[model samples]
Target: LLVPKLTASVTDGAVGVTVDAPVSVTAADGVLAAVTMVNDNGRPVAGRLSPDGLRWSTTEQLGYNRRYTLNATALGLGGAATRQLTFQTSSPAHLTMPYVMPGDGEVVGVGEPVAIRFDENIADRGAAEKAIKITTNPPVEGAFYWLNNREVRWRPEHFWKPGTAVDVAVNTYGVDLGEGMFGEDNVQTHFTIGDEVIATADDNTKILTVRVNGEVVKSMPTSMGKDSTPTANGIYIVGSRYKHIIMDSSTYGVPVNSPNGYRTDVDWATQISYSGVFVHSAPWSVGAQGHTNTSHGCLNVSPSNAQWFYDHVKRGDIVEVVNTVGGTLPGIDGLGDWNIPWDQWRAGNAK
Candidate 1:
């Protein structure tokens, strides 16, 4: 009976091992039995066998940070040959502060910023920055902002133009993230910048008209709260977009069962102006939209129509809110900074 020796390493969710015996040499004689794989806990996980009693393989889902032992037994007409090998799986590739903007599967305005935040403390900021990538059907010039060792954000040198397709690619796999850590893999996300949907919010009217391609596509009828719950007006940027959002009065210091407070889920939450203001579908407020604007001061549109708007709009899309009885739009909502003018928007990058 001849037993073979083995050596192995795990990479990219795969385990490759080499046997130290001639392929033509038989362990026993006739057909082979199975090769079993067991974890350190001694529980059998997977197994495979060869018809010729000379080779074996394993069919198991390799997990990160795991140690496994492999035992192969060859049963032939003559006898049985057995061998045991042990190895440990490595941890996930180290990610040095990988940042993803809009998070995963998120929608943004056509004029919104594409932000990415990283976690690792980087030494070679430029080299680490060079590893960042952004792609679009038609590309745009996006730059990275290295905010210290554990955070980095990316945005277009200018605002994204309307009616353009954009895709973001982050290739961090195998990248050394200092102190013996490396990036695990790459990530890709696609988004579109739809036609311009701009609104003007005047402190007096409390109404916002949404226009697409210079045409008034939706006229949202909204009501603002009293001065106590007033909504701010300004030229705001879309920071977050959600298809379905739960409205909880508790967030605003209101009791759930209070007369002025209740819980409800709003759909098509296209957040144009920050400060928790959203242009969303209000099916429950069907009678209020375009009639009696009664809300906590957020612009309300019909749920059915909001669905259409959500499908057609993209991040960075222009939304101008004017005519409001509330204070001016706040700066923390990411408004009024190096605003990307139209001509500059037309000349931005596209790859």
Candidate 2:
């Protein structure tokens, strides 16, 4: 006995993309039989034979960015017949930059707030929120806030305690965000907290230093702005931490086209002070690191060394500041909450 015409097609991730031809089978005698379909990768797929042995169909999960061949065989009273077909799957949709907390590749202070931002616009607010998941070693309860259509932020109701570690994951696949859009099944990143914080403040001359457990680790050659662009003489704590951040005049209301202004994205930027100040690699301004102070007011370190400092530092590490010709560091100015007197810091909070 012989089989009839058999056809097969494969799709990817709920979207339809065409594969090659459908395997065909011919049966001379009128005898109902079973049909089997195998993909190009030698995996068994779904297929059905008609009651009259004249038609067949198949359904199978195909791989993305991969090629597949369909092969079908029909069995009858006498024997069986076989045929083959081939096709390929398309690449899955992906967001340019996945939503990230503490920013992509960032190290924050223990008291630092959690924040997340996405590159693409999220249509379904609730669905997008559910896609974001966070886990911490100390297990702190947190919530996510939808900032806008394209941005969402997450943070614990309260500041994280010292010595706590956190992990975040975003499963965007199959999440419909409206307008027929869905998140790709992709995972974000993972990062950890380090030892005590190391923050510094200076009046331009003397520098104040603080350690986690009264243990002085190591100090590198550091310098702040000069009289012209003197570092903001204020007590500040690390507010936001970013491994790579774009420094743009627009961030400070200074147009990039203006003089002494340019829009440039800097990588490996570890923000030590929250008032738009950071301690980052400065390969472009090597001559201005320790000796010559030249920045809007932020501390500049060698790019290679900045990475080292970032790797060792953790959230909630204390950073103390001291001497400088400038004024004393003020509280609540920058990320200077840490600089606030312990009593005052506690008093400001409502229990």
Candidate 3:
């Protein structure tokens, strides 16, 4: 018998193979003469042969729940041999999709965290977290913190350095998320860290100080909430901005006609909390800015200063309020992720 012997990675009639799994073929006592692979639609699958011509492997990615066919030929001293095989990928009962924040090509502040929210509930947190990969320009150390079963975020021990580049790769395709669910597809996002813009508002001093890149920039007079509704003291992250917005007291459970309730229009508003807290232009309280606290739990800044801040601040910038009587802001209220301590954050890691 002078015929060559050929072998394939996947046995004939294989089923439920992973979409990313590669198929390889090898020959013994011979060299490969030719190899071809195709999909169910007769489309050719990309592959490569080893330099010695004894091994061939699939190079392209496969689609889910699809069948692939591989044909191979080998030559020996006196005869030729051939082999063929077909395999099928799995079709999951359920699929989960990942939504990433700080989208591709975006420039976010140093305080931003890499957030990934899943559409389906994930029971195996470790399996999901392991599929994600993060690479930084200077290689910073970071960890993931799961806010809930469906949301997980990654952040460094401290704030990111300005101008750092970050890349996130989510390879969840075909990966198990538990409860009979699998990830649908792979996703990726690249972003850059912008300047370090931080603002500090002190209730006692009645002043708001803004700094960029560790240098003092602006110190503006601010009027916080009065004795009845004092501002909460905590670190917060800037979100969206509004050129004009209606400030409704009823949003906070107080009727408009009540003694401490009134509806008003505001300008140059910068949102900091989900509970309707903002640092906005309040011209009516200009005279009381440096001397007393007046507005209903919002930072009241002069028109000029508020406009200046609105133009300069970007998303994920830090805003901290100190020494207020209304207690601290909850971590779930906006991007208050910085409020969590480092030890606690590390302890929350699923992997």
Candidate 4:
């Protein structure tokens, strides 16, 4: 009963086998010279021969609603033998795929986080996380934070060093995501880092100095918040820039045309805070520039300066605000976490 022989993972007439069922064979007696598995069209199901030449296995799983043939030749302990088997696997009722961002070939600022949103709710977070990998050139250390069961993101412990290249590999093909939802395909994306753009705004002097690639690009006169509505001083990131949009005080609980409220559409609006703070073009405030602080909380600049700053700004660019009558704002959200100390950022969560 211990003689050298050949065997297959499925029975000769195996049916209803799951699509992802493993294909394997073991030789009890002799060294297996080779094993070939192919589809009905003779397309080989890629696999490998064991070094010891005794066992054969498949690198990936079988496909749904497909038939496969396994052929094996072996040298028996005391003789020689060959084996063959054919099996068909069943299809699944549902399939799910995940989409990743920043997308492939995308150049993003260092503050941009990696997001993987799944089409299906994955019950197996461990397996899914392990299947995804991010490697950076000029390597950086980061960790994945689960926003929810369906979405996850990876943020570097510190801001990504400029010029760092990013490679993301989602090798979830043939792997289970959970709840009977399997990953659709394997994908990889490559991205690059762009230049550094940082700036400082001094509320006391009513001036904003912008720097690109470590050189001061412009020193612009800005109208900051007045005493009644002082601007919060802190570092903020350039969240998003808009060419034109209506700026309504009502959006922030101040009614239109009320005693300190006005409704006006703005130009070259760049949001820097979640709390109604922006650097925008204010052709109306040119005379007050670098002299008096009269804005609600935004830093008002000339139209040309606003457009130039908006064009050069990116998501991760830094904006440092200081010397305000009001105290510094604790960076809470909107990539303002960078406003916190690096040691505290390592403490985890915007502390």
TM-score of each: 0.52, 0.47, 0.83, 0.65
User: Where is model 2 poorest over a 10-residue stretch in terms of lDDT?
Assistant: 12-21
Between which residue pairs do clashes occur in model 4?
32-53
Residue 80, model 1: lDDT of 58
How do all the candidates rank in terms of lDDT, highest first?
Answer: 3, 4, 1, 2
- Per-prediction CA RMSD (Å): 10.4, 11.6, 3.6, 6.0
Q: For candidate 4, report its TM-score.
A: 0.65
lDDT of 2 by residue, 56-118 (tens): 665433344555554555556556565555555444454334655455565556555444555
Tens digits of per-residue lDDT for model 4, 183-295: 77667788877787777898768889988778998998999988998888877767778998788888877888888787889999988876678899999999998999889
Runs of candidate 3 with Cα error greater than 4 angstroms are 1-13, 21-32, 40-60, 76-81, 226-229, 245-265, 349-351
lDDT of each: 0.57, 0.55, 0.87, 0.77
Give per-candidate clash totals.
37, 33, 0, 1
Candidate 4 regions with alpha-carbon error over 4 angstroms: 1-99, 117-128, 146-151, 172-187, 224-232, 246-264, 271-277, 291-297, 323-334, 340-351
lDDT tens digits, residues 1-351, model 3?
Answer: 667999998888998877645789998889999999998999999999999999999887767778989899999887899878888877777999999887799898888889888998888898888899999998898888887778888989899999999999988887877876788888899999999999999888999999999888999899998989888899888888889899888986789999878799999999888767899999899999988998788999999999988999988888999987888887666478888898988787574
For model 1, the superposed segments whose C-alpha errors exceed 4 Å read 1-109, 117-128, 135-141, 145-153, 162-167, 176-182, 190-192, 237-245, 249-262, 266-269, 273-275, 281-294, 302-316, 323-351
Error of 1 at 23 (Å): 29
Cα deviation at 199, candidate 4, in Å, is 1.2
User: Where's the lowest-lDDT run of ten residues in candidate 3?
Assistant: 329-338
Residue pairs with colliding backbones in model 3 are: none
**What does candidate 1's lDDT look like per residue over 1-351, in tens digits?**
534433223222344221211112134344445466677798876545555556555554454456677655666555656656666554544545465666455545555555545665665555555666666556666665443455554556555576556666766654554554555555666666655666654445545666776797766565554455666655666555678999777876678897767688889887655346677887777765554557776767777666765776566566665555667664334443224343543343221
